[PDB]
Amino acid sequence: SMLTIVQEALTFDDVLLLPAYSTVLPKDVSLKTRLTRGIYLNIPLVSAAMDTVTESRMAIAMAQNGGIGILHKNMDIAAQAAEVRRVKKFEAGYPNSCKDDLGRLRVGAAVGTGADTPSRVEALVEAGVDVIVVDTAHGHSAGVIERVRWVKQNFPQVQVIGGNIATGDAALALLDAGADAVKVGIGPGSICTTRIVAGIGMPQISAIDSVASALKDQIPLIADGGIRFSGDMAKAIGAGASTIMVGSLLAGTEEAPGEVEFFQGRYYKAYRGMGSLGAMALVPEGIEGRVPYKGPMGNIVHQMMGGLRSSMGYTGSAVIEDLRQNAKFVKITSAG
Amino acid sequence: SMLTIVQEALTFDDVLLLPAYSTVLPKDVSLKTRLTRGIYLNIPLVSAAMDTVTESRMAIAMAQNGGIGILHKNMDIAAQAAEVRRVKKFEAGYPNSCKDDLGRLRVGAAVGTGADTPSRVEALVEAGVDVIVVDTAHGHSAGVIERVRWVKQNFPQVQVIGGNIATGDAALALLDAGADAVKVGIGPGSICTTRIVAGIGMPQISAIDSVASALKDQIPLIADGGIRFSGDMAKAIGAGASTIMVGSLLAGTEEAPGEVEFFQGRYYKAYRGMGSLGAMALVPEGIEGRVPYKGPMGNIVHQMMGGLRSSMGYTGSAVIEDLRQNAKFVKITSAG
Amino acid sequence: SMLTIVQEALTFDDVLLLPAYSTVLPKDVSLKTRLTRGIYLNIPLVSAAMDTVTESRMAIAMAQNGGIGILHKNMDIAAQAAEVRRVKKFEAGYPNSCKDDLGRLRVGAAVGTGADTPSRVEALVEAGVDVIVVDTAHGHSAGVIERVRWVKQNFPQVQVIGGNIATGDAALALLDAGADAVKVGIGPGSICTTRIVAGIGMPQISAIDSVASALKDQIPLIADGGIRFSGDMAKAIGAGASTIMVGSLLAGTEEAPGEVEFFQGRYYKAYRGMGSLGAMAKLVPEGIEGRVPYKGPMGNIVHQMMGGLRSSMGYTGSAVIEDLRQNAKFVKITSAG
Amino acid sequence: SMLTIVQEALTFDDVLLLPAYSTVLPKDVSLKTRLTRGIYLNIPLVSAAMDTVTESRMAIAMAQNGGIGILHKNMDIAAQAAEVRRVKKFEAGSYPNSCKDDLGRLRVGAAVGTGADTPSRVEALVEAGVDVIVVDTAHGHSAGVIERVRWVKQNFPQVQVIGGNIATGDAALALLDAGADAVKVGIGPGSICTTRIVAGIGMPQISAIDSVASALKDQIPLIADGGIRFSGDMAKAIGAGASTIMVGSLLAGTEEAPGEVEFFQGRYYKAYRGMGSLGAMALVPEGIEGRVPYKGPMGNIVHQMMGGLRSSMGYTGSAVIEDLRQNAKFVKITSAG
Amino acid sequence: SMLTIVQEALTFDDVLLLPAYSTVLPKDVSLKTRLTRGIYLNIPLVSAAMDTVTESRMAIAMAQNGGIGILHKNMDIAAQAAEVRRVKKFEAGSYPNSCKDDLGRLRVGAAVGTGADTPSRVEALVEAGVDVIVVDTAHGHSAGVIERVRWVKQNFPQVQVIGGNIATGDAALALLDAGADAVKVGIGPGSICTTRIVAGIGMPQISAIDSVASALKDQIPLIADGGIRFSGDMAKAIGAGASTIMVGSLLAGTEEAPGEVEFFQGRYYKAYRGMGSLGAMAKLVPEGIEGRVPYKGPMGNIVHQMMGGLRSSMGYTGSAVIEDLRQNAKFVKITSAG
Numbered sequence A, B: 001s002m003l004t005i006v007q008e009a010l011t012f013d014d015v016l017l018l019p020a021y022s023t024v025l026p027k028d029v030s031l032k033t034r035l036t037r038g039i040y041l042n043i044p045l046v047s048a049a050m051d052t053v054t055e056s057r058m059a060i061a062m063a064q065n066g067g068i069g070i071l072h073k074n075m076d077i078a079a080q081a082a083e084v085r086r087v088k089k090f091e092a093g094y095p096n097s098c099k100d101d102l103g104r105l106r107v108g109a110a111v112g113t114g115a116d117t118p119s120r121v122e123a124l125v126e127a128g129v130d131v132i133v134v135d136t137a138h139g140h141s142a143g144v145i146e147r148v149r150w151v152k153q154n155f156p157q158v159q160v161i162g163g164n165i166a167t168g169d170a171a172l173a174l175l176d177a178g179a180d181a182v183k184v185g186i187g188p189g190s191i192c193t194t195r196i197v198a199g200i201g202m203p204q205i206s207a208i209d210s211v212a213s214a215l216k217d218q219i220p221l222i223a224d225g226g227i228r229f230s231g232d233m234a235k236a237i238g239a240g241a242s243t244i245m246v247g248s249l250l251a252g253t254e255e256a257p258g259e260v261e262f263f264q265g266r267y268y269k270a271y272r273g274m275g276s277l278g279a280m281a282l283v284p285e286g287i288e289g290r291v292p293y294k295g296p297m298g299n300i301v302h303q304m305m306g307g308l309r310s311s312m313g314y315t316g317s318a319v320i321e322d323l324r325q326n327a328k329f330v331k332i333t334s335a336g
Numbered sequence C: 001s002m003l004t005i006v007q008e009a010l011t012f013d014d015v016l017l018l019p020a021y022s023t024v025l026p027k028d029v030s031l032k033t034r035l036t037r038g039i040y041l042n043i044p045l046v047s048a049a050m051d052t053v054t055e056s057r058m059a060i061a062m063a064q065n066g067g068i069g070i071l072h073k074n075m076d077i078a079a080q081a082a083e084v085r086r087v088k089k090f091e092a093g094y095p096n097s098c099k100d101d102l103g104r105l106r107v108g109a110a111v112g113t114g115a116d117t118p119s120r121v122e123a124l125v126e127a128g129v130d131v132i133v134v135d136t137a138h139g140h141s142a143g144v145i146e147r148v149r150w151v152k153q154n155f156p157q158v159q160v161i162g163g164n165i166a167t168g169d170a171a172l173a174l175l176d177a178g179a180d181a182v183k184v185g186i187g188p189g190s191i192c193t194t195r196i197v198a199g200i201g202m203p204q205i206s207a208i209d210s211v212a213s214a215l216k217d218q219i220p221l222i223a224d225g226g227i228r229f230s231g232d233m234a235k236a237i238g239a240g241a242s243t244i245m246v247g248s249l250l251a252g253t254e255e256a257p258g259e260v261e262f263f264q265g266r267y268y269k270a271y272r273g274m275g276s277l278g279a280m281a282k283l284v285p286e287g288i289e290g291r292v293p294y295k296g297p298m299g300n301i302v303h304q305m306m307g308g309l310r311s312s313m314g315y316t317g318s319a320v321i322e323d324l325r326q327n328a329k330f331v332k333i334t335s336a337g
Numbered sequence D: 001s002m003l004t005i006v007q008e009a010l011t012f013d014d015v016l017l018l019p020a021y022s023t024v025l026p027k028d029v030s031l032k033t034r035l036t037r038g039i040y041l042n043i044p045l046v047s048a049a050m051d052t053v054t055e056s057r058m059a060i061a062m063a064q065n066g067g068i069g070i071l072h073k074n075m076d077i078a079a080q081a082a083e084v085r086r087v088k089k090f091e092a093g094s095y096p097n098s099c100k101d102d103l104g105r106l107r108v109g110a111a112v113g114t115g116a117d118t119p120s121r122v123e124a125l126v127e128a129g130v131d132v133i134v135v136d137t138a139h140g141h142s143a144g145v146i147e148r149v150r151w152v153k154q155n156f157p158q159v160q161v162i163g164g165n166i167a168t169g170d171a172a173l174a175l176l177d178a179g180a181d182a183v184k185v186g187i188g189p190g191s192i193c194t195t196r197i198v199a200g201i202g203m204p205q206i207s208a209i210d211s212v213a214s215a216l217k218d219q220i221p222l223i224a225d226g227g228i229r230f231s232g233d234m235a236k237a238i239g240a241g242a243s244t245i246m247v248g249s250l251l252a253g254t255e256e257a258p259g260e261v262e263f264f265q266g267r268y269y270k271a272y273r274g275m276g277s278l279g280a281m282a283l284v285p286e287g288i289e290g291r292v293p294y295k296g297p298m299g300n301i302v303h304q305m306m307g308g309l310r311s312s313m314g315y316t317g318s319a320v321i322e323d324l325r326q327n328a329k330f331v332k333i334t335s336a337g
Numbered sequence E: 001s002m003l004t005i006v007q008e009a010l011t012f013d014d015v016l017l018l019p020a021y022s023t024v025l026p027k028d029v030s031l032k033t034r035l036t037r038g039i040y041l042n043i044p045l046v047s048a049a050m051d052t053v054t055e056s057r058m059a060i061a062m063a064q065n066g067g068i069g070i071l072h073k074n075m076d077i078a079a080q081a082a083e084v085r086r087v088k089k090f091e092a093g094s095y096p097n098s099c100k101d102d103l104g105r106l107r108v109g110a111a112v113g114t115g116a117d118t119p120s121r122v123e124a125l126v127e128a129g130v131d132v133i134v135v136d137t138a139h140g141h142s143a144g145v146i147e148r149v150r151w152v153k154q155n156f157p158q159v160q161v162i163g164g165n166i167a168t169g170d171a172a173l174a175l176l177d178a179g180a181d182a183v184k185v186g187i188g189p190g191s192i193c194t195t196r197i198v199a200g201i202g203m204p205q206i207s208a209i210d211s212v213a214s215a216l217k218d219q220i221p222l223i224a225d226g227g228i229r230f231s232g233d234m235a236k237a238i239g240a241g242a243s244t245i246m247v248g249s250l251l252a253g254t255e256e257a258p259g260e261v262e263f264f265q266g267r268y269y270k271a272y273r274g275m276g277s278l279g280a281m282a283k284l285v286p287e288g289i290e291g292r293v294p295y296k297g298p299m300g301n302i303v304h305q306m307m308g309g310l311r312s313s314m315g316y317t318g319s320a321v322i323e324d325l326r327q328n329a330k331f332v333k334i335t336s337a338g
């Protein structure tokens, strides 16, 4: 009677996209989309700001495949600015490359809300960073809203992203602060334990829908966490996402940080949450594990974009915006 | 909210047929039905157009038991036309046999939308094929709609089927194109990975219902994919299907293509999706595996038809059309 | 849309009974109920008409504990009438015993719709059977409806049950035929494969509710099949059942037919569906053949199952079976609950 | 010490045959061998005398492929003699490797016990044209078996006689002395066998064959009965001293084997049970009752087994069965190997 | 090398009995044997002195089938003597194979320790009419057991005495010189036993029986105590040199065994625990586990299945009497593959 149930929230496995009239072949579809209101990517993939996913090596390949990588903040201001420079000064000895006005590969960097943030932001913009990601566990906070407002007023020459959020109210708050894009994701990550530890969360399909409906395409959103297959990406874009941030899928690849480990005859790479005991050294909100060796990241990216191309062919979507505006879904049961 | 949820789509496991007043015994029911608006079968079974399910041997046996087999297109025009001739020229040394006006066993053949289709269609009709199946992964496309219209206009002496579809709008499109029957099924196949790779699909009970409700019995529909038991067949017919296409159930049988393999003391036969890496040599949308040796196909067909007879006895359906028009269902939970 | 979905049907695991104001202790509740409009039992338990559950030995113990056993029809007319006689002529060398007007232990017998049915029915009534169970897989048939009408017209001195059913329309049909009780159950049995083979069924809580709502307490119903625990029995009675038929729970007990088998150090007894390949030896099987572990004397299982139903009546404030039947309140639970 | 350990007995998995100098290709080897001192087979395979393995159908297919079937005794004298006649009167509607008698009729064997109906059974089988009488019990080193084989040889010298089951050299000499034309070796190795657990009796098959063969000194052949899972076991058995191999498990589940195909959980199976199981007897049971997967025509399985044996003879440099029997060299392997 | 490896010790699963020439059918064999030098049983079966196996009910049933029951010591002197009286005063309201004394009363045995209450316990049990006193500890080759056995024989010559538990020939000779009428063999083979893990002490049962039997030279019989899972183990034990077999696990879970039936996860069970478990003791570290065995129903069924299997074994070896199997059995050693 007094319990407030806002809605029955839906995840990726709760829905399926419906096929519609199509005259487009998967090989002919355009994967071009917008990361912010000022930055466009050639593929809707964004590599996760994590110490086991993105560093300079991963950020180069992402951009080289038409996407973008967000360097993690679990490194000192000097280390992060040095990683930005490595991506910006990289020269090929890739026609679908994601580059700036000066023909340099695009890169992003993650920042907190704390005391070293003004020095961190200044050093990253100076190093030539394209986008600043003001990212915490709870983006619907004065700390994130006001830190986003600070970066837009003091550094208008750089694009700013606010995260993480899962409601329409949070999106309007960050829109008013001057965010160029919002990062959507509260509890969906594969290594995430936020739901068990805090009982806080919002299944990703309803999270994207809530944010996208409030924004009214004024700024794009990044669907962050919980992508296991190429089908999830199509559902995310269909629900309202402009891009998709992945961690698990890019972890274990050659380009990801960490050396290959030989455990029980097989090859693995470490994969851990940024809120895990190992990543922090608050009660932990993430796990530490090992993912199998996937080889060059290019293979995984091609296989994922291949699946999204087929989905766009099934929905009759020639461009990303066609899938975003015309997608029709069906709700499925546990049997389906 | 901006998210468009058309309906809560239902699969076979989501529903159960209700028993109704009955004066008919299972051994007395008529399994006679229509494959197309010109072809009638003695049983509602159709063998899948797959390189591990239907070739000349399987088509003969399907036709001998009162069903029909669709010859696969993973062979050259000359091989496919020779397979049509093998079934049409077959002479028994079977009172329920499915035969044409000339007393020859009935056969069907699958065609694509590619460049070799006019030469393939012409050679199959010349070889005496009863039905042409214009089938792709996405039948709600200009490619399938216009090819179905081409076959009907250029070869009116042959029956044409369009597939695969899962919506009422797709059915009306193929109906207006001149299809004699529609093939329903987007994502329910046992070897299918369309749902994981593309995030596209429609649970089979809701797919059949949507198609059947739009058609208004103007042309029949084949419920294609996802049949595991004889109960699924009864649910499919009750939902609106006239015939049922099966791959998994007929794979592993003596008549199915492929030699028996002796693995770990047991006997198996290969079973693979037509969108698998092995079948194509687009990102794969099917798996490759082994099914246990089932022996002569006749046994499996009799067990399946036996179960459908019991269901018609429970519903008080003397004829297939009684189950199609009078069936009443209940929705069941994950506990049921 | 043209698809006809009558309702979202519920099973035992879909619901939970709510506790209500209570002044009654579980040890003080009355388990007395009615099998038919003429037969009353001291406990709501009925043993299944199965060749691995009820024969003379099981019907005696069920009647001794307050219940009733239904003898199976997978035996000739002479064998079945002899089994009726064994129960009726049994003398103790049990205060809650279910007995007739002549002080003899009560017994039931299953009959089909086939050609031997008039000879079978006549021989069972002559042997002193209390209730005739006209039992097939599909009781909403002319075969069952007309046979129940034949038994009532030709043998009014005996009580008649019709089954199996799962809808209100089927219940009204058997009520108009003169059935004294209806047996509810289409697809909930533990050994049943009707749902996989025919795609036919009705989850038991919705089946009981549909039948009970149509009947309006004119004749009782036997909730037949799908009982795994004592909680299911309380849910069944709360949904509208007057009695409960069990097979799996009484299988494996000392009293059940079959000799104990020593497999891999443990002790088991056979348990099979009446539509299995082995039980039938035409129709495709609709039941499985298996082994249940040895449970020892049936008395232990009956006491545990009646103990659980007593606690439930204590939780609902139900002093008598009719209090649970008329006052029970439920909540629907998800797959998480 | 008082404990008498005769030897460390070896099974199939304890040994491996060594490859030796070879000039023979597997396709060129001769699989011809002797079943008895008077009967020769074209392949060293025998189908077990079991109610789920050999009846007339299996015996015809066995004979057609160059082997022989031993019809089971779990049927009356009239039915068993009718099964012998069915094999002897069989005419092809082509099998060049067919095992046939002097009159060009397919060869067949029949199992007999030591019971009271044995003289009537033996007389009726010889009259029906049986080629070999198998006096087979669980314990062939008994007065019952020894004297019955001696009775068959003295009263019916026109027929070949086999004695079994045995596992020692002393048992072989006893049966050789009574006039057996061949001995059957196997105490405890059967796949469905529980003799080892129930009686604590047994002898691993490689040591059982070796013990029997060493005592006989090729005077009469021996049949390696039980425990064959793969084509490699057959080569090890022949190398150890066997002239033929009896199989039950491998031929069970085939089209030709007795029993109808059963559809359990989507798959196809056939029954397979020990002759000392509760079901086969209706002594404490010494065998289990189970289901084997449907293998289709027996011909496929036989070709796979004879193919594997051909490769083995190619590896050993064995042109004829007798070359493998006399020249095979083995190595003992550990639990790691 | 300085490490002393006495032998490669063998268990039940390491050996198989060989079939030999036979003229006697399993239904015709004699299962009669001797428990002590003065007591004979009609079947070679003894129920274990455990609080979840043998109380008066199990002992009555054991004797009625021709065996004997050893009453446990995890009860006061008055209760144990009352259990002896219950078996001795039992009268049938038919069991032709019953194991009875000179006065036609069902035979019974009782377990005693080496503790301070032992003289009062022994005196009260003999007074109650006990047939055999079992001086049983975890280690029978101790001054405590040897001297207590010697005390019982000297002070109560009218009663039979058993000494246990032992696993060597030296131990057997020590108890033989003490005046034991029979020895109980079993160090570490118990199903609920953890002696091997806790102390690293043990001797596989086939070699334990062989070592004891070879030293004794049939002067006194031995009871194969512990590690019997099937009827085949019993035949191997007798063939190795045992006159009787003590079983705990096989008789636990039966109707006659102490404890009420428990309904866990739809099934019926009875408790079964080691006498050296935490629960049985309530300052030695535990040497046994506490568990549940499935409900087996009347003990008669289990006993008939075991004696049936042993009958077949004697019919395979050509053993008309127990002594034929004991003296003529031939074995083969098998590998992990066999």
Ligand SMILES: C[C@H](Nc1ccc2ncc(CO)cc2c1)C(=O)Nc1ccc(Cl)c(N(C)C)c1
Residues within 6 Å of the ligand: A136, A137, A138, A164, A185, A186, A187, A188, A189, A192, A194, A274, A275, A276, A282, A283, A284, A285, A286
């Ligand atoms: C330890 C935990 N770790 C992380 C780390 C990275 C994360 N990244 C994303 C998400 C979204 O599920 C959660 C995350 C939690 C974490 O930051 N908790 C956490 C919980 C509640 C609040 Cl209000 C805050 N504010 C930002 C101070 C932080």
Ligand SMILES: C[C@H](Nc1ccc2ncc(CO)cc2c1)C(=O)Nc1ccc(Cl)c(N(C)C)c1
Residues within 6 Å of the ligand: A022, A024, A025, A026, A310, A311, A313, A314, B136, B137, B138, B164, B185, B186, B187, B188, B192, B194, B274, B275, B276, B282, B283, B284, B285, B286
């Ligand atoms: C590789 C995959 N393979 C298959 C093959 C056979 C199938 N057969 C049936 C179904 C039913 O979902 C799917 C199938 C997918 C496939 O064809 N994908 C696919 C995906 C989207 C589009 Cl728009 C198209 N159009 C026909 C060009 C094809």
Ligand SMILES: C[C@H](Nc1ccc2ncc(CO)cc2c1)C(=O)Nc1ccc(Cl)c(N(C)C)c1
Residues within 6 Å of the ligand: B022, B024, B025, B026, B310, B311, B312, B313, B314, C136, C137, C138, C164, C185, C186, C187, C188, C189, C192, C194, C273, C274, C275, C276, C283, C284, C285, C286, C287
């Ligand atoms: C083979 C099966 N076997 C059984 C046997 C006993 C049963 N007893 C109860 C139930 C309740 O689901 C089903 C049963 C099925 C069975 O009777 N099928 C069956 C199916 C449909 C109809 Cl219309 C009929 N009519 C009565 C002739 C019979």
Ligand SMILES: C[C@H](Nc1ccc2ncc(CO)cc2c1)C(=O)Nc1ccc(Cl)c(N(C)C)c1
Residues within 6 Å of the ligand: D137, D138, D139, D165, D186, D187, D188, D189, D190, D193, D195, D274, D275, D276, D277, D283, D284, D285, D286, D287, E022, E025, E026, E312, E313, E315, E316
């Ligand atoms: C019940 C058992 N069943 C079988 C049946 C077939 C067998 N066939 C082969 C083997 C060899 O392991 C054992 C078998 C046991 C069986 O015959 N026991 C059995 C045990 C010992 C003896 Cl002395 C005898 N004599 C012949 C009377 C019989």
Ligand SMILES: C[C@H](Nc1ccc2ncc(CO)cc2c1)C(=O)Nc1ccc(Cl)c(N(C)C)c1
Residues within 6 Å of the ligand: E137, E138, E139, E165, E186, E187, E188, E189, E190, E193, E195, E275, E276, E277, E284, E285, E286, E287, E288
């Ligand atoms: C706790 C343990 N419990 C038991 C109880 C009964 C047993 N019964 C048999 C066996 C055979 O290993 C071991 C047993 C251990 C036990 O008594 N240990 C134990 C260990 C070493 C010694 Cl020298 C002694 N002496 C008698 C004082 C006792």
Ligand SMILES: O=c1[nH]cnc2c1ncn2[C@@H]1O[C@H](COP(=O)(O)O)[C@@H](O)[C@H]1O
Residues within 6 Å of the ligand: A048, A049, A050, A164, A185, A188, A189, A190, A191, A192, A193, A194, A224, A225, A226, A227, A245, A246, A247, A248, A249, A272, A273, A274, A275, A276, A285, A286, A287
């Ligand atoms: O420890 C953590 N707790 C919760 N979420 C985390 C943690 N570390 C990273 N994340 C989020 O999870 C995403 C990775 O999601 P995934 O692709 O499902 O592995 C990241 O991009 C973050 O938004």
Ligand SMILES: O=c1[nH]cnc2c1ncn2[C@@H]1O[C@H](COP(=O)(O)O)[C@@H](O)[C@H]1O
Residues within 6 Å of the ligand: B048, B049, B050, B164, B185, B188, B189, B190, B191, B192, B193, B194, B224, B225, B226, B227, B245, B246, B247, B248, B249, B272, B273, B274, B275, B276, B285, B286, B287
């Ligand atoms: O690779 C594939 N991907 C998806 N669906 C497939 C593929 N190959 C065949 N199918 C469909 O799956 C059906 C077989 O369904 P099944 O009876 O559930 O095995 C075929 O008749 C096709 O409609």
Ligand SMILES: O=c1[nH]cnc2c1ncn2[C@@H]1O[C@H](COP(=O)(O)O)[C@@H](O)[C@H]1O
Residues within 6 Å of the ligand: C048, C049, C050, C164, C185, C188, C189, C190, C191, C192, C193, C194, C224, C225, C226, C227, C245, C246, C247, C248, C249, C272, C273, C274, C275, C276, C286, C287, C288
């Ligand atoms: O083979 C069969 N198929 C379907 N239902 C069966 C079969 N045999 C018995 N039944 C039903 O299942 C009940 C037993 O239900 P249980 O208590 O869940 O084991 C019986 O009382 C019958 O109503």
Ligand SMILES: O=c1[nH]cnc2c1ncn2[C@@H]1O[C@H](COP(=O)(O)O)[C@@H](O)[C@H]1O
Residues within 6 Å of the ligand: D048, D049, D050, D165, D186, D189, D190, D191, D192, D193, D194, D195, D225, D226, D227, D228, D246, D247, D248, D249, D250, D273, D274, D275, D276, D277, D286, D287, D288
């Ligand atoms: O119940 C039984 N107990 C023990 N051995 C058996 C039984 N029935 C048959 N056998 C033997 O086991 C053989 C079959 O061995 P398999 O090829 O390993 O299955 C038969 O030829 C018999 O010698």
Ligand SMILES: O=c1[nH]cnc2c1ncn2[C@@H]1O[C@H](COP(=O)(O)O)[C@@H](O)[C@H]1O
Residues within 6 Å of the ligand: E048, E049, E050, E165, E186, E189, E190, E191, E192, E193, E194, E195, E225, E226, E227, E228, E246, E247, E248, E249, E250, E273, E274, E275, E276, E277, E287, E288, E289
């Ligand atoms: O806790 C214990 N530790 C070790 N052995 C025990 C314990 N309790 C009883 N035993 C022995 O184990 C035997 C039971 O053996 P079982 O038949 O294999 O269960 C008893 O007769 C004792 O000799």
